Amino acid sequence: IFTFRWLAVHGLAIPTVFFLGGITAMQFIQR
Amino acid sequence: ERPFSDIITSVRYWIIHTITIPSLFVSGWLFISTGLAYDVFGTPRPNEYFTQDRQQVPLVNDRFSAKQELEDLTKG
Amino acid sequence: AAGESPRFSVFGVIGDGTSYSEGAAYGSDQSAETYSPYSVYGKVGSKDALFEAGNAGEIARKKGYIVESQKRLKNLPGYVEKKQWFNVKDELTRYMYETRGAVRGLAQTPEQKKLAKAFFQAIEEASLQATLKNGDKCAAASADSIKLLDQFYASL
Amino acid sequence: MITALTALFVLVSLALVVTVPVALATPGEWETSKDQFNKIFQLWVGLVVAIATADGISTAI
Amino acid sequence: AKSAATQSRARGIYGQRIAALESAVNAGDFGAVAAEKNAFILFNSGAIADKSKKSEAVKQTNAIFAAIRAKDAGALKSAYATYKGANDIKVIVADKESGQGYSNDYDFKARTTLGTIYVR
Amino acid sequence: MLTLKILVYTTVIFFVSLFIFGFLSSDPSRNPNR
Amino acid sequence: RVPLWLVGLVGGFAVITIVSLFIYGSYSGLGSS
Amino acid sequence: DLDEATRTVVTDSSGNTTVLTPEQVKRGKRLFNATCGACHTGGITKTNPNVGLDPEALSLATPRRDNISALVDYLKNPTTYDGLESIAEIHPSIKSADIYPRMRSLTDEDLYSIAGHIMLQPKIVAEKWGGGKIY
Amino acid sequence: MVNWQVIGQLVSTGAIMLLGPAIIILLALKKGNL
Amino acid sequence: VVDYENVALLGGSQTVDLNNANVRAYLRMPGMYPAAAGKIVTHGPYKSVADVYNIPGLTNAEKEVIKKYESRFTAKAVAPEYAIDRINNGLY
Amino acid sequence: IAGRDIESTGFAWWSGNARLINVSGKLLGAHVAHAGLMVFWAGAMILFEVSHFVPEKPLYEQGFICMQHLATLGYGIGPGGEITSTVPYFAVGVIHLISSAVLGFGGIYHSLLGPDTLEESFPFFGYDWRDKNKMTTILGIHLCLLGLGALLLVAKAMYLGGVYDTWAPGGGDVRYITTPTLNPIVIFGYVFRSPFGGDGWVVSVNNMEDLVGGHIWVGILCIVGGVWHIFTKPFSWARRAFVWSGEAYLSYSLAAISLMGFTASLYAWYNNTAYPSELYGPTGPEASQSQAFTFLVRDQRLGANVSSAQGPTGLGKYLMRSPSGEIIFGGETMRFWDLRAPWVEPLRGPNGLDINKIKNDIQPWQERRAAEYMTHAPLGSLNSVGGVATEINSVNYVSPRSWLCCSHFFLGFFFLIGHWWHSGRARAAAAGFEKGINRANEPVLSMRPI
Amino acid sequence: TEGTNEWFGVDDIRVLAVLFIGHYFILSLWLGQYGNATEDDDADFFGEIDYTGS
Amino acid sequence: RLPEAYVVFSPLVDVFPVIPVFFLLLAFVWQAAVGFR
Ligand code: CLA
Ligand code: CLA
Ligand SMILES: CC1=C(/C=C/C(C)=C/C=C/C(C)=C/C=C/C=C(C)/C=C/C=C(C)/C=C/C2=C(C)CCCC2(C)C)C(C)(C)CCC1
Numbered sequence A: 001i002f003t004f005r006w007l008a009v010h011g012l013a014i015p016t017v018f019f020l021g022g023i024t025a026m027q028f029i030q031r
Numbered sequence B: 001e002r003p004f005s006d007i008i009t010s011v012r013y014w015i016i017h018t019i020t021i022p023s024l025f026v027s028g029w030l031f032i033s034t035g036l037a038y039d040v041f042g043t044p045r046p047n048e049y050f051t052q053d054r055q056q057v058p059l060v061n062d063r064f065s066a067k068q069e070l071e072d073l074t075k076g
Numbered sequence C: 001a002a003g004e005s006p007r008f009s010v011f012g013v014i015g016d017g018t019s020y021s022e023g024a025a026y027g028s029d030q031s032a033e034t035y036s037p038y039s040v041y042g043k044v045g046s047k048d049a050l051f052e053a054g055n056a057g058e059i060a061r062k063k064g065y066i067v068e069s070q071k072r073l074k075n076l077p078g079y080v081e082k083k084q085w086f087n088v089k090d091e092l093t094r095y096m097y098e099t100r101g102a103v104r105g106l107a108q109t110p111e112q113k114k115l116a117k118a119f120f121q122a123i124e125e126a127s128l129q130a131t132l133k134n135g136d137k138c139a140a141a142s143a144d145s146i147k148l149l150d151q152f153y154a155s156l
Numbered sequence D: 001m002i003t004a005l006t007a008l009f010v011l012v013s014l015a016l017v018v019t020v021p022v023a024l025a026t027p028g029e030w031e032t033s034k035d036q037f038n039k040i041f042q043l044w045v046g047l048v049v050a051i052a053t054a055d056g057i058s059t060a061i
Numbered sequence E: 001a002k003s004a005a006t007q008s009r010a011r012g013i014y015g016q017r018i019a020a021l022e023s024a025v026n027a028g029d030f031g032a033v034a035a036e037k038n039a040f041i042l043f044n045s046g047a048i049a050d051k052s053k054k055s056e057a058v059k060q061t062n063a064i065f066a067a068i069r070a071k072d073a074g075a076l077k078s079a080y081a082t083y084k085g086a087n088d089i090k091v092i093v094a095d096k097e098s099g100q101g102y103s104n105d106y107d108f109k110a111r112t113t114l115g116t117i118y119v120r
Numbered sequence F: 001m002l003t004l005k006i007l008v009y010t011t012v013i014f015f016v017s018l019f020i021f022g023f024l025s026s027d028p029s030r031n032p033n034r
Numbered sequence G: 001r002v003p004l005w006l007v008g009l010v011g012g013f014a015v016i017t018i019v020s021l022f023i024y025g026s027y028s029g030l031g032s033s
Numbered sequence H: 001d002l003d004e005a006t007r008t009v010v011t012d013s014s015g016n017t018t019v020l021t022p023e024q025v026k027r028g029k030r031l032f033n034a035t036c037g038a039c040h041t042g043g044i045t046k047t048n049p050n051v052g053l054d055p056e057a058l059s060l061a062t063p064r065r066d067n068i069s070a071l072v073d074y075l076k077n078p079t080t081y082d083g084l085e086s087i088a089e090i091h092p093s094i095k096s097a098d099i100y101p102r103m104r105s106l107t108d109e110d111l112y113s114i115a116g117h118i119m120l121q122p123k124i125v126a127e128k129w130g131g132g133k134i135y
Numbered sequence I: 001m002v003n004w005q006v007i008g009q010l011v012s013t014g015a016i017m018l019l020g021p022a023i024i025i026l027l028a029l030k031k032g033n034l
Numbered sequence J: 001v002v003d004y005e006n007v008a009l010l011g012g013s014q015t016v017d018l019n020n021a022n023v024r025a026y027l028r029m030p031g032m033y034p035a036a037a038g039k040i041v042t043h044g045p046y047k048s049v050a051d052v053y054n055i056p057g058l059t060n061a062e063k064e065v066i067k068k069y070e071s072r073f074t075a076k077a078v079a080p081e082y083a084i085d086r087i088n089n090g091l092y
Numbered sequence K: 001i002a003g004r005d006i007e008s009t010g011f012a013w014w015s016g017n018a019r020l021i022n023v024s025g026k027l028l029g030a031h032v033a034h035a036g037l038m039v040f041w042a043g044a045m046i047l048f049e050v051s052h053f054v055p056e057k058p059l060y061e062q063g064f065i066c067m068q069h070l071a072t073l074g075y076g077i078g079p080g081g082e083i084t085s086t087v088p089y090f091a092v093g094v095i096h097l098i099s100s101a102v103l104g105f106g107g108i109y110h111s112l113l114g115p116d117t118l119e120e121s122f123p124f125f126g127y128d129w130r131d132k133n134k135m136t137t138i139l140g141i142h143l144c145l146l147g148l149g150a151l152l153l154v155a156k157a158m159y160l161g162g163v164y165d166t167w168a169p170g171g172g173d174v175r176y177i178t179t180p181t182l183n184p185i186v187i188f189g190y191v192f193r194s195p196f197g198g199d200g201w202v203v204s205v206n207n208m209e210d211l212v213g214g215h216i217w218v219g220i221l222c223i224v225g226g227v228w229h230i231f232t233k234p235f236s237w238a239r240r241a242f243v244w245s246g247e248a249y250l251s252y253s254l255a256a257i258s259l260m261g262f263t264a265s266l267y268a269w270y271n272n273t274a275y276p277s278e279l280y281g282p283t284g285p286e287a288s289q290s291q292a293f294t295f296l297v298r299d300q301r302l303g304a305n306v307s308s309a310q311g312p313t314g315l316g317k318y319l320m321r322s323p324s325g326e327i328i329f330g331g332e333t334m335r336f337w338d339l340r341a342p343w344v345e346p347l348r349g350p351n352g353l354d355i356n357k358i359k360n361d362i363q364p365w366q367e368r369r370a371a372e373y374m375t376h377a378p379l380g381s382l383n384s385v386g387g388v389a390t391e392i393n394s395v396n397y398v399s400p401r402s403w404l405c406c407s408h409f410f411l412g413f414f415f416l417i418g419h420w421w422h423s424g425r426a427r428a429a430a431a432g433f434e435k436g437i438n439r440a441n442e443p444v445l446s447m448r449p450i
Numbered sequence L: 001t002e003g004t005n006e007w008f009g010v011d012d013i014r015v016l017a018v019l020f021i022g023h024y025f026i027l028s029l030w031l032g033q034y035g036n037a038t039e040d041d042d043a044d045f046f047g048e049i050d051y052t053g054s
Numbered sequence M: 001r002l003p004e005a006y007v008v009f010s011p012l013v014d015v016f017p018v019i020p021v022f023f024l025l026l027a028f029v030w031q032a033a034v035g036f037r
């Protein structure tokens, strides 16, 4: 819950998934 | 304790992840699709590099009056 | 301006489709037929193609090629007499490069095919004997080639 | 018609590809199942010959 | 880094913008004249390298806008004329025989009336 | 310049022959486990 | 309760799909000349 | 955006113009890059740099080739810069399509689209069509 | 104008990829000489 | 040389020197490039603009196309470093 | 399971195919399976290339590498190098794809269900890696097969349709090679000459007669050597020089295959007789010579006297002399004066280029060829842009010559690394110290101090 | 000369003579040690390295 | 193009050449199945 390991792994894996979704959305933008 | 080889097997981990991860992925997709990023970060859209009046590259040319200069260059 | 969603096109099947940059279109963005999904051009023999096949220009070009090739072939005996083999080998490939194309384009009947094959064999033998430096065989092959090409043009 | 023949050939080949290694690896299965595999091989060769003959007839002038 | 190139860029862009207002101020377009407040401020801030001249330009611009907020068609014209006379603002169009306003992109004269290019 | 060519050829063939016939003299048996 | 040779297969499938999507986008859309 | 003001090009010698459809632009770019691009990439001529494809060079040619009709006519019957001799045997054309097999499947719409692409490029890129490596 | 080419390619590659793990899993279930 | 007086007559102006200019200088006069300019740039020095009409082999057409633009021509002293490169001067 | 784990064999999983060294039944199946994979790839690739064909472009603008071999063999090609039909390519692909299935079934059977070792029930197909007679017998058999293959190629060249000759008298076309050369001096002077510039070693074969004669000699030599190695046993000077084990034989083969890969890559880069230029595109030197030819023709047509023109250095802008006297093209292409091409030979005399022929006997087709070859030079980038490294994205072209050369050169170097590794390990294992140094009897400790 | 196609670069008798002399001299030195080898079927071995003396 | 009768199969031909890479990966999958003996 408040252990150091959980806060770490999470605080570096949530933005990764958010950004990956963002890039996948970017892949279909048309000029 | 309980090293990773045990987490990658427990079913509660699987159910909480299957309910949590797609929400974040869809949130990122919607963040890009709705056009909010262009507003948050100021990135020009593919049809906003040159306006009808300005046909040149808009380089900032002042230090202490950057706000007014950027406001004029953006739309005005 | 203030807020606008960017244009989307998924593989050309879910979206606009024609956005000046799509890729993987294979057609389906133009009102015309293509040779294949991997091609940009249309069918060659289609009804609206500007190029015919066998019009007057082609026939005139081939016949001019044949006539000038006969005129060029009439020089080999002098080269063989002077023992200038490089001239013999160069004459058969300088202007006469299009002779095979013209002959194969103007031959339809089987006897024309036989004449063309005989003429090609004769000139090949002439070139071989020129590069082997044998005067008699080269002269005989040159005479045979002249006669065969004259016969083929007469049969036209 | 040869399109249907080619489709049948493709399906038979897919079945053979899925089936044969499984029979070979398991002990004893190849010993017992060695009568219908001959039938499938004969059907494969016959389909090949039929496709070749039909294509040759269709395209030869 | 402030230098002569910064002054050249600011002078070009904002002086052209200000000189474009001559016809508008001749008859009177108070709203359209006030629409170039940012241009006036930018020209005052980044096109004059002199403390006294900058102060005078700020005073003149303040007078111009004070006349604007009065429906005063005469004081506005007089202040605009004296600003133009002091700061040497005029519309400039170039040719190609004696030209070459720009060569590449990134220039503030790429697609303007000042931009002429001679290709050998 | 021909004499230089002759001398160089002699030297090269001498050393190359030394190499070739040295490797043919039961080389694999020259190990500390003989 | 999945043995540790199927989960890796799923992860590999996801990674391959993501990489193929980005190498395709290189070939189409924005930034494709 | 690619408006209709920027898609207006001159068609004939009198001065009449037209509006190119968005599909014609794509077809013209594709066909040009497929057929011309080996020798006419970027608006220049590789095997004879004296005769370019920029608007100024097209305007100072004899039969004047700064419009769609003249470009189509040139594609159907090429000539030299002064319009005196025919060069159909050393340049691709419909007349010599028996020599160049890449021109045997072209219709009138294809030529129209290619000419439209050539005419449209200067209004978009400007001074980079036929400019060379300096730009 | 529905672009059957892309759907065909995707379906074909998916089936071809799935062909292998299927036989491996079948052998595992049937207790073969893996 | 460091200083060359007649530098404006090499193609950068409206007047072309008949004795030193490259063949590209005639590309801005319509109807003259591939036929008449090639004959002009491959013949000996001219003491006057009127001497260009004595070139052995000029057909009529070249004569009137030259007559049309005669007002844009001049003939100066021959500089050997410029006259040797009149067909190809390395500019592309 | 015994024989398939580290406990019973060593050789952990990432080195598992090394457990088949002394198992002669599964090794046969493995080699047969790789052969089936090769055949399958050949058939699939040629079918894929056939499916994407368009008749407007030439073969070297479509990124093909397999269709050109069939075209050179004389299938579906016309005068001048124009493709007229693709059905034979389809037939070849179908045949290869069908044969791959039989090969694969044989491999999987001999690997999974057949006997583990063949030395007890099939003495004919059995060996020990140390019985020199059996190894020589196998070598001779497969050598005789190679010789038969070479003779088959000769038979195809002489009777079964012919091959495409690019030096044909009257434009490149298919013809019968009726009088191949057989004088051993010519063939073995091709073999025994220098590899440097002007010589070219075996890459410099420049006509079809020498090609046919060489493959004839190769067939004869292979048959004779196969019979000889079948009926004999290694002599004394060979017994005491080699190491007799499987890994040693593998290393011996690896070295030769690396050399062959290097030679093939240089064939692809330099030769234009077995690799006609209308199917693979121009070579390196050919494009530069074409550029020089094109600008020579243009400047001469403008009215210039292209024999007396002086370049910036004072050396000659279009024509000059080679360091041995021959008249050649000028410019930076003075390094490529050894080129010989079918579109430039008609203008050559006994001492180089002929001035009289150049002045007033140049044909439009040579001009067309030079213009085409100048703009399709073998230059490009990894993402297939084409042109010089400072070009913009408009063209999509990389020549097949560059692909073939680079790929097979890379493979040759890595197989040389294979020679080194596998041979060193083989000899160390044969001596008996591949597992490390013995603590009790360290060899260095019993040596005189240095 | 330079671009000619002689075998091993041999353009004179002396070059061939010196090549022969070199190979033959080293060959005779090697023969002085290995010239008594026989092909009878008892000098062979069954192993990976020939340890059978000479 | 393929001959007119077989044009329907071109999606399969577009994927045929890449199979040996799948064989190479299948080797690793098989090894992982037995848990790297
Ligand atoms: C005919 C060729 C040939 C053959 C039959 C062998 C045979 C052998 N080698 Mg050898 N080798 C060769 C060529 C060859 N080698 C070459 C050219 C090299 C130089 C690179 C080596 C380097 C080498 C080393 C360093 C070792 C061997 C070993 C072995 C033995 C076990 C090999 C094994 O289990 O592989 C197992 C196979 C794998 C684990 C697969 C690895 C996957 C590779 C690295 C991928 C390569 C990238 C590929 C090209 C592209 C990937 C695309 C992908 C993204 C889809 C076996 C006797 C080993 C041994 O024990 O010797 C006694 C050993 O240690 N070899
Ligand atoms: C060309 C590639 C190739 C080939 C032919 C082989 C062949 C072989 N390997 Mg090997 N190997 C390879 C690559 C290859 N390997 C690589 C890259 C690695 C590194 C990961 C290994 C690692 C390895 C190890 C660690 C071991 C082998 C072993 C073996 C042997 C027995 C395999 C076995 O028991 O099957 C068991 C496997 C199965 C039953 C599952 C496969 C089922 C089939 C064959 C899959 C293919 C079917 C096909 C798609 C359908 C076609 C059907 C046809 C009718 C069309 C066999 C000779 C073993 C050995 O030495 O045996 C003595 C062993 O211990 N290999
Ligand atoms: C042993 C082993 C291995 C290997 C394996 C192998 C290598 C295999 C092979 C396999 C193979 C090698 C296979 C093949 C197959 C083939 C087939 C199956 C074919 C088929 C064909 C068809 C079906 C065709 C059809 C058609 C026609 C006829 C016409 C046209 C169209 C088409 C094309 C469709 C591994 C490593 C994995 C692992 C370990 C063990």
Ligand SMILES: CC1=C(/C=C/C(C)=C/C=C/C(C)=C/C=C/C=C(C)/C=C/C=C(C)/C=C/C2=C(C)CCCC2(C)C)C(C)(C)CCC1
Pocket: F019, F020, F023, F024, K187, K188, K190, K191, K202, K205, K210, K211, K212, K213, K214, K215, K217, K218, K241
């Ligand atoms: C086909 C052809 C041809 C060819 C022919 C021929 C005839 C070839 C041959 C070839 C050959 C004929 C080759 C050979 C080679 C050899 C080799 C390659 C050898 C090597 C050696 C070795 C390897 C050894 C080593 C060693 C030493 C030295 C020391 C000791 C140890 C040992 C023994 C190891 C030609 C070109 C004409 C043309 C085209 C076609």
Ligand SMILES: CC1=C(/C=C/C(C)=C/C=C\C(C)=C\C=C\C=C(C)\C=C\C=C(C)\C=C\C2=C(C)CCCC2(C)C)C(C)(C)CCC1
Pocket: D010, D013, D014, D017, G005, G008, G009, G012, G013, I016, I017, I018, I019, I020, I021, M019, M022, M023, M025, M026, M028, M029, M032
């Ligand atoms: C021809 C033909 C065909 C085909 C056949 C074949 C021959 C196929 C099979 C084969 C196949 C095609 C197979 C595949 C499989 C593969 C896979 C799918 C793989 C995957 C992989 C992975 C993903 C891996 C991963 C991993 C792991 C697991 C662990 C360790 C690490 C790693 C990462 C490596 C058919 C039937 C259509 C019919 C027609 C004809």
